[PDB]
Design an enzyme around this catalytic site. Structure first.
Site: not given
Ligand code: SAH
Ligand code: SAH
Ligand code: 5NR
Ligand code: 5NR
Ligand code: 5NR
Lengths: 334, 335
Positions: B126, B25, B277, B117
């Site tokens: 998450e 990406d 993505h 990130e």
């Protein structure tokens, strides 16, 4: 993980629209059935038909279109209810009867003249639905009754997967886009992408194929012992010679089935038009370099997983060139 | 359980494919590359903590930007790969890979900067943000730099062109194969729209029915942002539709912003911007609703941790389309 529980999760996979969309949008598959049925109009017209695992009911409607007087649309998934609607909607509830539940315990009022089923899983035998079609052959089909399709053949060839080659090479390209050398991850990437023991379903073409494809089994659905054989394992030996230089990544297998004439073949080969079955890949742990005339031979067995009898296992013994014989054991990916 | 839920979460990052996907990406990876470089003056000579270093790439960009030292903390087994990469680019003496959760790792000092990130699907799936904030409170010097420094969340009504065809599929059967299956349209809608999962899919600007609305802004250095976020984030939104369309629900997406050197750099996951993505996260109505030009669409949205799994994003949505009654749907991130 009782048998009942596992049977019931398998059926429930077919109770959602997405798989039926996929089957039916598969023109190659769907037409082979439509045409295969319509050409047997002669042996169907006014006769009786059991559609093993009718799904949305499409194939049972084709049979009525071919001239059958009555069709039993047997289906264990909750999709039977959708099938029932499709039959009522097309005005056919008189000639097409939807029956809920497993074909192994369903009670039909009579013997049938023919059976239709699209029973083929990835690598042909994943799902183990063929035992159900054979149980139904033995229990419901009349002496010299028709089976559609009537036979199946399985094929293998070594491959040099171009997609996989690109993905393994990726790490060496990181440097030029981002200025960070990640070429050292190739081994890791190889362990991840090749050194597992899963059967990988992927669409190949001619350019992935390293030799002449070899048929390694043939299943004649009328054959006496075929039930027992599926449980013991179907397969056979093979050999071929490589076309030229290439990193060999493993093998692909695929199948075809055949309807009798009034001689129609539904093929899932990578040289033929694409189907939703694609091909089933058996990757070696790492690439092996091959050359023109490199001998590649072995033996392959397709059989039930130990923990799940509906899950496809492949035992593969193989030899590449002067490398020693090696062995790999695979199970169908979730 | 917890330790167990976490070892399972970290194990999703030990396979090659997700790292390949992230590094392939370019929109993501370049934005970090350039976000970091643009911040050269504030990193030059300094110490950085890379939270979830993965293959080590971001830690290496910080070193390339002149960081005196970088601590690459990574809880997945992929830390071994980060080390192999750091050694391979000749940087063992400057980038230290430290195995384990950022929560319990022992740095030899406080840092001047954090890079991470941490963005999941729908930004907050998450819940890696918790980790980043814990590191910030524990390890970040006062006056320290965060990268990215902020995040914003956007919602908009949509007509998903792909979904439309898939719902239309059953009506076309008749023409392809001479069997009418139009009656399965309802069944298809139920399976495809009537579930309670957030669907991750890529849209284009043509799927978008109105002007995107920002519903939440997250300023990462805001002290107390940690507690705030236990409750959930979000807000009310309103907009007007562009034209006739079968409306299927909403898309949500995010951007993050890096501080200027050079001015601020934004990494966007908008359907109007180059694909990444993350795609977008789709919240489908139970069935389509026909809209027209200037049809009002209003509502409220909260993104919050699901009850049995704090790392799993839950979205609570209240909405009204035109003159239809106010409705409600409770969504959870797919598996
Ligand atoms: N033992 C069994 N009895 C009845 N149905 C079965 C079965 N085993 C599998 N099935 C069903 O068989 C179907 C195979 S997929 C094919 C469905 C349909 N005939 C079509 O061609 O589109 C699934 O719907 C599955 O639920
Ligand atoms: N509490 C925690 N401590 C350390 N690492 C964590 C963590 N929570 C998540 N991670 C890791 O953070 C990473 C997020 S993906 C980003 C990977 C890499 N920095 C890159 O830019 O490509 C994953 O590798 C995940 O395993
Ligand atoms: N007769 C089965 C033909 N297809 C059906 C689709 C594939 C298997 C699958 C089942 C259910 C859900 C997803 C995927 C491959 C075999
Ligand atoms: N910082 C996370 C950035 N990406 C990483 C991958 C996606 C989530 C995922 C993780 C692991 C396996 C599959 C999928 C989306 C978020
Ligand atoms: N538990 C420590 C505090 N974190 C701080 C960041 C929060 C991130 C988030 C917000 C909303 C939904 C899902 C995830 C969750 C709680």
């Amino acid at each position: 993980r009782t048998k009942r529980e596992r049977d019931q999760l398998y059926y429930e996979c077919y109770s959602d629209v997405s798989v039926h969309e996929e089957m039916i949008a598969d023109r190659v598959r769907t037409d082979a059935y439509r045409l295969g049925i319509l050409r047997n109009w002669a042996a169907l017209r006014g006769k009786t038909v059991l559609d093993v695992g009718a799904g949305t009911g499409i194939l049972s409607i084709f049979c009525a279109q071919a001239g059958a007087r009555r069709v039993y649309a047997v289906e264990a998934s909750a999709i039977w209810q959708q099938a029932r609607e499709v039959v009522r909607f097309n005005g056919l509830e008189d000639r097409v009867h939807v029956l809920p539940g497993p074909v192994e315990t369903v009670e039909l009022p009579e013997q049938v003249d023919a059976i239709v089923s699209e029973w083929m899983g990835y690598g042909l035998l994943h799902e183990s639905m063929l035992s159900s079609v054979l149980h139904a052959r033995t229990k419901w089909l009349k002496e010299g009754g028709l089976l559609l399709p009537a036979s199946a053949e399985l094929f293998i060839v070594p491959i040099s997967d171009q997609m996989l080659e690109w993905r393994l090479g990726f790490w060496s390209q990181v440097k030029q886009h981002y200025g960070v050398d990640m070429s050292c991850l190739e081994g890791f990437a190889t362990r991840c992408l090749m050194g597992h023991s899963e059967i990988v379903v992927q669409g190949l073409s001619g350019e992935d194929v390293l030799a002449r494809p070899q048929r390694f089994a043939q299943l004649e659905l009328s054959r006496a012992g075929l039930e027992q054989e599926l449980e013991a394992g179907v397969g056979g030996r093979f050999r071929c010679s490589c076309y030229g230089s290439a990193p060999m990544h493993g093998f692909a297998i695929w199948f075809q089935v055949t309807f009798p004439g009034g001689p129609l073949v539904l093929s899932t080969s990578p040289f033929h038009p694409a189907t939703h079955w694609k091909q089933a890949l058996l990757y070696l742990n790492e690439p092996v370099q091959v050359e023109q005339d490199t001998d590649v031979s072995g033996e392959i067995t397709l059989l039930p997983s130990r923990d799940n009898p509906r899950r496809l296992r492949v035992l593969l013994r193989y030899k590449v060139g002067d490398q020693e014989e090696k062995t790999k054991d695979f199970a169908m990916e979730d």
